[PDB]
Enzyme design. Structure first.
Site, PDB file in Angstrom:
ATOM      1  CE  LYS A 156      -2.733  -1.736   3.419  1.00  0.00           C
ATOM      2  NZ  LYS A 156      -3.544  -1.601   4.576  1.00  0.00           N
ATOM      3  CG  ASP A 192      -7.783  -4.599   7.135  1.00  0.00           C
ATOM      4  OD1 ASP A 192      -7.663  -3.743   6.274  1.00  0.00           O
ATOM      5  OD2 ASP A 192      -7.127  -5.773   6.884  1.00  0.00           O
TER       6      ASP A 192
END
Ligand SMILES: Cc1cnc(Nc2nc(C)cs2)c(OCc2ccccc2)c1
Ligand SMILES: OC[C@H]1O[C@H](O)[C@H](O)[C@@H](O)[C@@H]1O
Length: 448
Positions: A156, A192
């Site tokens: 990311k 997550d």
């Protein structure tokens, strides 16, 4: 057609998605066996969150979320009712991530986190207490236990140096002691995807998948322990972070990768990595559009052949534009203002093409993703009973929740690939905060 020829390149046939769905199922089995787990592109990581929990603790917990664009801190309370724990965020606060944190060392990053954690504890006068701390850490982690695991590598676009290879939970503590300002008992570190599944289980006990489609794209599911060879044991189920964003890193997508994908990958913080994620993620979607547009002006099909100054700088086209564009009511004012801000003066058919370009990019993303989920759900369906196997999927992420049509395109396509399955989607109302807390609540019936 001259435009529609260039766009039709993003298309994927029903038979194409099936092929992708089968290839995912394959990499999934490969990363679960000991003999391939090592070079499996889909790492299939044990989270150590396990089928039958022992029992849970009640009270407030401190939850962290990092891996977003933004670091967040929140306090969540946890109780018990009829069917398991209830959880609820009671206080919270976001903290932007500086450039001097992302470039510096892991050590610097975490102190900054240590600070925000103290800043928070100030504003709510709680610095004097020591609560269980749940950490949602949205990166590939090799867990040794529910509170032990090292960073496999950044995704990311995080860089913080000398972080890969080390225990994350450790570093967190390291930074808290580099303060003395407070104490915290760090009881659980979760992904997550996983935080989200757990937050949703309590709503629907059948919730056994967590999928995130936001800046990145990942999923996690409950697997049979006898299938989790990297962990000892055969009874019950352990949640497995697939980290499927790395799908295609072994070159399983190559027949589908367009030039615009090759270009994004080349200039990314991680060439050759998260290839599947780069077809879907939010970090990358606006960029795919941008590249598509720039191709279109270099073929004198758009903006009179003349690209803007910003239209030409990387990342200038934000994923959240792609949404706005695809939201335009048909009057073109939404689309105009956008390109306006980017230094262009779109004709009417300029706008209409940009709409078409977005739709091409996002819709590919929708379907590409559905193949992935479908391949998880098929795999689960395989090691498990049956008739019409009902199953619930907890979902989160801006792309899924906000992009106007990704959700619809995605549901339709998933279903096309999963007959005999009745899939239910729930969107996690704060899934990070409460998923972590919920998992800490049960980790903390061991560490307290
Ligand atoms: C809220 C919740 C929190 N934690 C659970 N399990 C956990 N196991 C460990 C080792 C820590 S927390 C848990 O297990 C129940 C379950 C979840 C998902 C699928 C199947 C069962 C639920
Ligand atoms: O942010 C969603 C996903 O982003 C990236 O793929 C991370 O490696 C993964 O751990 C996370 O679940």
């Amino acid at each position: 057609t001259l435009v529609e020829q260039i766009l039709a390149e993003f298309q994927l046939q029903e038979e194409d998605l099936k092929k992708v769905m089968r290839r995912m199922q394959k990499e999934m089995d490969r990363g679960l066996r000991l003999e391939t787990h090592e070079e499996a592109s889909v790492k299939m990581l044990p989270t150590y969150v396990r089928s039958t929990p022992e029992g849970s603790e009640v009270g407030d917990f401190l939850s962290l979320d990092l891996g977003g664009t933004n670091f967040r801190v929140m306090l969540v309370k946890v109780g018990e009712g009829e069917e398991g724990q209830w959880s609820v965020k009671t206080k919270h606060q976001m903290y932007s991530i500086p450039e001097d944190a992302m470039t510096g060392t892991a050590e610097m990053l975490f102190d900054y986190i240590s600070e925000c954690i103290s800043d928070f504890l100030d504003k709510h006068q709680m610095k004097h207490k020591k609560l269980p701390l749940g950490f949602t850490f949205s990166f590939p982690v090799r867990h040794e236990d529910i509170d032990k695991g090292i960073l496999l590598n950044w995704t990311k676009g995080f860089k913080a140096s000398g972080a890969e290879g080390n225990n994350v939970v450790g570093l967190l503590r390291d930074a808290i002691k580099r303060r003395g300002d407070f104490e915290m008992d760090v009881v659980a570190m979760v992904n997550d995807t996983v935080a989200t599944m757990i937050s949703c289980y309590y709503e629907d006990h059948q919730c056994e998948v967590g999928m995130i489609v936001g800046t990145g794209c990942n999923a996690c599911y409950m697997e049979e322990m006898q299938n989790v060879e990297l962990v000892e044991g055969d009874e019950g189920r352990m949640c497995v972070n697939t980290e499927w964003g790395a799908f295609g890193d072994s070159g399983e997508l190559d027949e589908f990768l367009l030039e615009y994908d090759r270009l994004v990958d080349e200039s990314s913080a991680n060439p050759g990595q998260q290839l599947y994620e780069k077809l879907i993620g939010g970090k990358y979607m606006g960029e795919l559009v941008r590249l598509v547009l720039l191709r279109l002006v270099d073929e004198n099909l758009l903006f009179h052949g003349e690209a803007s100054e910003q239209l030409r700088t990387r990342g200038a086209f934000e994923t959240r534009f792609v949404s706005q564009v695809e939201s335009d009511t048909g009057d073109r004012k939404q689309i105009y203002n956008i390109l306006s801000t980017l230094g262009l003066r779109p004709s009417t058919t300029d706008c209409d093409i940009v709409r078409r370009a977005c739709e091409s990019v996002s819709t590919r993303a929708a379907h590409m993703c559905s193949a992935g989920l479908a391949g998880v759900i098929n795999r689960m369906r395989e090691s498990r009973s049956e008739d019409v196997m009902r199953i619930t999927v907890g979902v989160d992420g801006s792309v899924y929740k906000l992009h106007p049509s990704f959700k619809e395109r995605f549901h339709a396509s998933v279903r096309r690939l999963t007959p005999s399955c009745e899939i239910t989607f729930i969107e996690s109302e704060e899934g990070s905060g409460r998923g972590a807390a919920l998992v800490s609540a049960v980790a903390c019936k061991k560490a307290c």
